[PDB]
Amino acid sequence: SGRDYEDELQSERDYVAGLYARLDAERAQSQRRYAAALREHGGTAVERDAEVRALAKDIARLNVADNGLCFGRLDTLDDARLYIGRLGIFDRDNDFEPLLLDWRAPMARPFYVATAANPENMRRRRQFHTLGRKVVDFTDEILGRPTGAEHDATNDAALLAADIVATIQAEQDQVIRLDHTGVLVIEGGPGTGKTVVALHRVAYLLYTYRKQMERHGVLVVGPTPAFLDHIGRVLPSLGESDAVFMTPGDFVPGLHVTAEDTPEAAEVKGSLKILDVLKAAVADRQELPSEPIPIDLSDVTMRIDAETAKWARDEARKTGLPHNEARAEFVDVVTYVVTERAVARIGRGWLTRDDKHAWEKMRADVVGELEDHEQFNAALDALWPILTPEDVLAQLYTSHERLRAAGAPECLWRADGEAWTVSDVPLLDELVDLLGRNKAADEAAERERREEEAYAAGVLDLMVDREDLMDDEDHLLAQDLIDAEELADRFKEQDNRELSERAAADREWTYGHVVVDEAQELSEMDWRLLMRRCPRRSFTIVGDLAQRRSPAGARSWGAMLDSYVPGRWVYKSLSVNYRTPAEIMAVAAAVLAEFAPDATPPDSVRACGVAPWARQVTDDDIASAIAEFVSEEAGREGTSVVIGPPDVPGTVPPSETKGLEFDAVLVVEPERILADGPRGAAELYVALTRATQRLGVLYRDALPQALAGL
Amino acid sequence: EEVGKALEEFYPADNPIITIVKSGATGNLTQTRTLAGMKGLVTNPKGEFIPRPIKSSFREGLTVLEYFINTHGARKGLADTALRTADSGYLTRRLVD
Amino acid sequence: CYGRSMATGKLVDIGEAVGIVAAQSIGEPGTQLTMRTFHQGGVTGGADI
Amino acid sequence: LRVQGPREVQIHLVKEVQEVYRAQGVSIHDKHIEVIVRQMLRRVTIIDS
Ligand SMILES: [Mg+2]
C-alpha cells in the first residue's frame, strides 16, 4: 500500500466531500422552495401542483442519491477527468462544466463498455468503494498494457504486469462485448479470472439493456452475493431496488433451506427422471377405499364403494386437469352417482321415472342436502384430498409404501418427512405446478370492495346535481368525470412495495435477466426451475465443470441447456492462466488428470519461482503448524487462508472457498479431503487453486500419489 | 423570480395596479408579474413543465405558439377543480360520520 | 373542556353540536390541499412526498 | 399507543394532522381535530374477565 496511494485517496475523498457539500446546498434550496410553494404559491391549482411535484421529485432524487454519490472516475487519453456518480452536478458559475456525470449520461457510457482491447478514448478506470458519504478505498484498472505500479484490490494490473497479454485482452473483450442477448456460458480454469470477465460482461449487458430491464428485474444465483455486490457498487439504481439474490435452497419464497442431502438421494432428486415419480405420487393420492363408507344420511342409508370411487377417480384422471382443479370433476361425478342412487331409493312406488320436475326435483333436493352433509365432506376429504407440496412430500418420504408404489427408490426415505434439504426445494416448487391452486372464492374481499364502492357512490350522490346548481354558469361537476368505483379505489391503501421485495415474494415472477455463478453445481431440476422463471432465456452462466462437487451438478453444458435453447446458447472459454503462479497449476494439472487422461489445463504465464512447500506433521504438531502459518501470514501482506476438514478447528471447509482468491493458502491433510464424498479429489483441486502468491500443504504420513511433486 | 423582483422594485408605491395588491384587496404579485412581467413556465397536458418559457406578457401580447401552449393547463384546471371536490367531500363525509 | 366557542367568542353552551362544527371546519378547506394525481396511469405518485 | 399510551398517541395524531394542515397554509384550531380524534380512541379490547 503506497503512500502516494494514500495521498491520492485523500484527494479523491476531498473531492467527494466537495460534491456532497454542493449536494447539501442543493437539497436545502429545494426544501426551502418546496415549503414556500406548498404554503403561499398564489397561482392556479394546476401550476401549484406542477411546481410542488417537480420540487418533491427533485428532493426525492437527491435523497436517493445521498447514499454512494460517486461510482468512480475515468481518465481520458487527453488527460481529462470524468467523475461518474448517481447525480449530474455542474458548475453553474463555470458554464455548467460537469463536476459529476450521471451514470446514464452518454459520455459516461465508456465506464461500462470500455475495455482494454477497445478503449473508448480512456486510459484508466477507477472504482470507489463507498459505505456512505465516505470513500473507503479506490481500485484502478488500466485500459491497455499494465505496468504494475497501479493499486487495485483485485491485483489484475500487477498480475498482468508480471503478445500473449494481447490475446488475453482480445479474449476478454470478445466475452464482454458479445451482443448475444441470450444464454451465454462463460467457462475458465482457475487462475484465469473468469469472475472479473463475468462481472464486466454483466455490467455491460445491464447498462446497454437498462431500459429493457428496468421493470423486469435481475435475478442472481450462487453460493455468495459477490455478483450482487458488484452490481450494487456499479448500478445502485438497479442493485438496490431491482436486483434479487437467491441460493438454490432459497428458490421457494418464505422457505429457506440449508441442509444438504446424501450424494445419491440428491442425484435422483436432482434429475428430471424423478419428475415422472412426482406425478405418480400425486396419482398415488387418488385413493379409493378398501371398505364402503356409510353416508349416514339423515333418512337414507346410502353408502359409497370402491366401484364408484374407482369410476370417479378414473374420470377425474381422464379430465387431465391438475389435482386441486380436477377435484371439481371428481366431486361432481361422485355427487351425480350418489344422488341418482339416493333419489331412486327415496322414489319408491310413488316415483319411478318421472324425469320432468319430479325426479329432477328430488335430485335437486338430494344434492342441496348432500353438499352440506358433514359425513359426505369428510369422505370426500379422505378420498382425493386437497394437497400442498409439503403434504405430498412428507407422506411420500415417510410411508415407505408410497415410495414403492410410485417407483421412487428407497435411497430417499426418512422418518422426519418435513425436514427439507436443498434438493427438495425444486421438487417442492414443481409440485406447485403439478398440484395447482384450489381456485377458491374470495367472498370477504369482494364484499369489502362492494361496500367501499357503495360508500363512494353515496359520496357522489351527496354532491349537488346539475339541475340545482346556483353558479353563474354551467360547469363540470365531479360526477361528470369520476365514477363510484374510481373514487372508491382512489382511497385504498394501494401498496407499492419495491421490485426487490415484490419479485422475491412472488414464486411466479418472471425476471428480465438471470445470472448464475458457480452454475455447474445446479441440478437439472434447478435449471428447469430457473428457465421457468426466465422465459426470456437471457442468462449469464458462469462456472467450471471440473470444479464440481455436487453429484447432481452439471457434467456438460449441452446436457443441461440443449433442452431449452438447442444450439442458441453461446459458449465462451478462457484459455490463459495468469492469476495463479505456474507452479500452482503444475500440481493442479496432476490433481486434475484423475478425471480425464488429458483434461484441459490452461497454459500458465507468470511463473514466480516461489515454489509451493509441503510439510510432514506428526506427534501432535499439525495444530501448531497451522498456528505458526497464520501467525506468519498475518504480517506478510494481503489475505491468507487455511483449508481443511471441519474436524480441525482452524480451517475453512473447502466448499466455502469455492470462488475466492488469496495470497497465501495452506491446505491441511489432503488425504482426508480426497476421501470426502464422491468428489474429494475435486475439492482438493479447488483448495489448491486458490493461491496467488504462496502455497503450503500439511500431510500426515506421505504425500498422495498426485501430490508427490511438491 | 428575478423579473418579479424587478417589477416590484420598479412600480411606484401609488400606482393603482400595485396599490390594489399591496393593500390586501385582491390578487398577488404573481398575477402582476404575469400581466406586466413575463408569463413564465407552462405545463404539458401530462403535467410536465415545458422548458421553453412564455417570455411575453399579456401587456405585450402572446404570440400564437405561446398562446397555444398556454391553453393546455388552462383547460386542465377546469377538470382539476371539479375533481378536487370529490375527494374533499369524501373526507368531509367520513369526518361527519 | 371544549372551552370558548369560536363562533360566539363565549364559553360553549350545553347542547351545541361541536362535532358537526369540527367536521365541517376540517373538511371545508380540503380542496386547498395537495392530492393524489388524477391521471389514470403511470407510477405511484406516493413515492415522492 | 403501545409504548406511550392513549394520551400521547392522541397528542401525536393531533400534532401530525395540524402539521399537514399548517404546511398547506390552512389554519384550523386544534380543538376540532381533538374532537375528531377523541372518537378514534373510545374502545378497549378485552382478553379476560
Ligand atoms: Mg359566480
Swiss-Prot record, chain B:
It comes from the Bacteria. DNA-dependent RNA polymerase catalyzes the transcription of DNA into RNA using the four ribonucleoside triphosphates as substrates. The RNAP catalytic core consists of 2 alpha, 1 beta, 1 beta' and 1 omega subunit. When a sigma factor is associated with the core the holoenzyme is formed, which can initiate transcription. Belongs to the RNA polymerase beta' chain family. This is DNA-directed RNA polymerase subunit beta'. The gene is rpoC.
UniProtKB/Swiss-Prot annotation, chain D:
DNA-dependent RNA polymerase catalyzes the transcription of DNA into RNA using the four ribonucleoside triphosphates as substrates. The RNAP catalytic core consists of 2 alpha, 1 beta, 1 beta' and 1 omega subunit. When a sigma factor is associated with the core the holoenzyme is formed, which can initiate transcription. It comes from Mycolicibacterium smegmatis (strain ATCC 700084 / mc(2)155) (Mycobacterium smegmatis). Belongs to the RNA polymerase beta' chain family. This is DNA-directed RNA polymerase subunit beta'. It comes from the Bacteria.
